[PDB]
Symmetry: C3
């Protein structure tokens, strides 16, 4: 069963237009298409994110109270969906929302493991960031090993880090800040940058990823999918594109393999910004790619699908 | 030695323009280019497909008598080419013609094995099809295991199924109807959908394909190549394109490997529809890609080719 | 440490515009970007290539004296840079300059091994060439095994072949003349054509390449990188593009792996011709791709880079 949550929120980064991700994904028939695969799909609507007009930067960190609150609300809504026995599907919205999505999920399933598909590690702290954009920091707020390195940023007093360095795998990396690379190598976080993907192939990547996270014991998976993880030729309508990304095929491979574990528990589909398509067709290409990736998470398979009936009768 | 047969036929599907495939492939210098690799290339011309004006649908199956007859004629012509000791090269034309091409081939070489390169399984029956388009059904007419599930469709009383479920390998699949997936899993047909290609790489795919078909004993290969098996970025001028296809490189890899078996016996180059190019360059890109794939089947190798002489003398 | 040498030279082939490669690569901030990775980057300027007005063809070989001289000068400059303890970085310019670059390098490091990344083998002799273009012949001038097959071509009396057939590996091949293929198979030269890359994946390719060249003993590597080795979709602004090339990812993989050997000693970045971009964006795409490949050679890594400091302090 699936619980859809819309998160029309942009203040984790500078470009307007990402708050429209939930609308365009919905207008592409996401809900109807999902119903062709699972009988029980519940749309919990778009979260009403109140304007927080007074929100001056904390040091260089931008819109901290807005970002913190949006994630707090989202965590509550994800925890509710999880309690209702459903897979949470978060339509973003910028990637700072993963703070809420993962935190909420972890309230119900503290043993979850995270697969983070992104060109970026999104693990800057409030102190290592040079942009101040909170969509480049969510992982730092979630990791137990970093608690004493996160300042008390207004808006985030509610956060309790819910994952260890061992509980996350990165796939797709190709634009990692030096401080983030320091944190990555210091904490021993498991990652498959595009170098690894090139070396091993996406087949070996997914085998290793899933062995790593699930080998010891079965536990819930959280897939946090930044559409910028895919090459700009597939998902151009996004805020921080980086060339040499994952292919459309590789994207579906990742999501097909995750689906087949039967352990998908939470999903974020993040950073679709239709306002940044150069043409109407760049928008449609991005949105269609996002929809495809999503459907694969809930069982659409390139080899085909059939219902348990005799089709020759 | 090579025997070229043109099959300018479209009534297996709705879009006009596929009947022009043989002309554009020929105008690209297919014949001359093939002569740079084999001395003996014989053009048996384009088959004269008579209009069959009275051809109402059989249930929802469209143009059944036209399709059946075109394939009957083609089977005769392929059998003739095979008897003349030549590799048959069928220029399509829509993929329903594979009924004729494979049937004819099998009259001379009943032990043939088929490699089917396509985004689609083309294995709907007259009873499972929802489109009624016969280019989505040819494999169902050919398979022995399905004989009792094919109704007596007008135009096809001449057909005798000539292959078993073990005698075919699919490569490229990514848009398989539920009924087709049922048939695929019921009959135990060997396939490499795009998921498999992604998992294993095209190298392992071709090793497995050829081990599967040829391991027990050497026998003739029939390659039925739907240009929609390649991604629309390579072969856009085709009727049923599906994103996330095989690459140009993968296409040449498949055909290079088949060539090197020395067992290529029949070839179909199908579903080029120049009328569907958005631009002149989409047409040329499609036609050039089709020509490349074809030349690779008869020995053009990316590492290079030389004649048995001393070039430093 | 790095020594940059500009080689604004085009007479190894017919198209003007390649002499501008060094300028556009420099205007893209190549030098500044390299300084973000190594403290000591020295620009030795552009070589002043004097016009040689009287330069009639030798048989069909074009501009032989111009090409020979440009390479002689370049060899001198590379040998100087090498003596100064620096990695030579040659900005081309057409690929005939590899005669000079490799020869110069070998004067200081006779044990070097060459990795040649190209759609072409560039190993025609003055006698096997059909174009007469000297950028299709440089390897033939360098190989010891061919000495008695190279005529005394005006401009090249200074050359002494400095590498054996065992000392070179080709990656990317896909348009090899028959005579070149004869030489390739006769001399037993190690190569990974696009067929091999497709078969094995770029991961296995680089493992095999580097095992082959370095397994016995560590020695200096010379990377001669023709941008036409990458697919025209990545590096369109070049004189002899060939479809089905290496990807942008594969290009960075090759160069990342070479970097990590710590044995990179000489680098050529060749055949960027901005005059051949169909649009300003084709030029920028080509130049940016060339710059990326170069930065990867000197340590820019897709997983990230950090300096030896504590970033959480
Ligand atoms: N590391 C940069 C880029 C972050 C981009 C965030 B993302 O992955 O969600 O698009 C920053 O800290 O601003
Ligand atoms: N399965 C669909 C699509 C078939 C397309 C056929 B083909 O592979 O030859 O393009 C149908 O039965 O119509
Ligand atoms: N083999 C052809 C093409 C050579 C192209 C050279 B190159 O790799 O440097 O672009 C010739 O001899 O002219
Ligand atoms: Mn992100
Ligand atoms: Mn990102
Ligand atoms: Mn087909
Ligand atoms: Mn098809
Ligand atoms: Mn070259
Ligand atoms: Mn070349
Ligand atoms: Na992003
Ligand atoms: Na087709
Ligand atoms: Na070139």
């Amino acid at each position: 069963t699936i619980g859809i949550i819309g998160a029309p929120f942009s203040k984790g980064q500078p470009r307007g237009g990402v708050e429209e991700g939930p609308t365009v994904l919905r207008k592409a028939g996401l809900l109807e298409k999902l119903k062709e695969q699972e009988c029980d799909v519940k749309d919990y609507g778009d979260l009403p994110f109140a304007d927080i007009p007074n929100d001056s930067p904390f040091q260089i960190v931008k819109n901290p109270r807005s970002v913190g609150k949006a994630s707090e609300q989202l965590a509550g809504k994800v925890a509710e969906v999880k309690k209702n026995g459903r897979i949470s599907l978060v339509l973003g919205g910028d990637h700072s929302l993963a703070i809420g999505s993962i935190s909420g999920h972890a309230r119900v399933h503290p043993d979850l493991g995270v697969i983070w598909v992104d060109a970026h590690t999104d693990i800057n702290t409030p102190l290592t960031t040079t942009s101040g954009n909170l969509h480049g920091q969510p992982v730092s707020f979630l990791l137990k090993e970093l608690k004493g390195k996160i300042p008390d940023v207004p808006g985030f007093s509610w956060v309790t880090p819910c994952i260890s360095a061992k509980d996350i795998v990165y796939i797709g990396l190709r634009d990692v800040d030096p401080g983030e690379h320091y944190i990555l190598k210091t904490l021993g976080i498991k990652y498959f940058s595009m170098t690894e993907v090139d070396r091993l192939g996406i087949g070996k990547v997914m085998e290793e990823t899933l062995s790593y996270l699930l080998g010891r014991k079965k536990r819930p998976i959280h897939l946090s999918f930044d559409v910028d993880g895919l090459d700009p030729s597939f998902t151009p309508a996004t805020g921080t594109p980086v060339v040499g990304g994952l292919t459309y095929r590789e994207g579906l491979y990742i999501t097909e393999e995750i689906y087949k574990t039967g352990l998908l528990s939470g999903l974020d589909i993040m950073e679709v910004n239709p306002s940044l398509g150069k043409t109407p067709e760049e928008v449609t290409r991005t949105v269609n790619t996002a929809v495809a990736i999503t459907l694969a998470c809930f069982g659409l398979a390139r080899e085909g699908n059939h219902k348990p009936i005799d089709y020759l009768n």
